[PDB]
Amino acid sequence: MAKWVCKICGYIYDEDAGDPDNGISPGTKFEELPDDWVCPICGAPKSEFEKLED
Ligand SMILES: [Fe+3]
Ligand code: NA
What we know:
0% of the residues lie in helices and 19% in strands. It has strands at residues 3-6, 12-14, 49-51. The protein is globular and about 25 Å long. It comes from Pyrococcus furiosus (strain ATCC 43587 / DSM 3638 / JCM 8422 / Vc1).
């Protein structure tokens, strides 16, 4: 699945990993993260992530 970078801090939202400590099961696509999910490292909103693909 896809990976996304937090443009602020460099955290990778890896769809295969999810974010279980913050309520997101492995395999959750970035689009399906709740609108108010934030980077678990720096707190940036979803808008600040960039999909790692051409
Ligand atoms: Fe971040
Ligand atoms: Na959405």
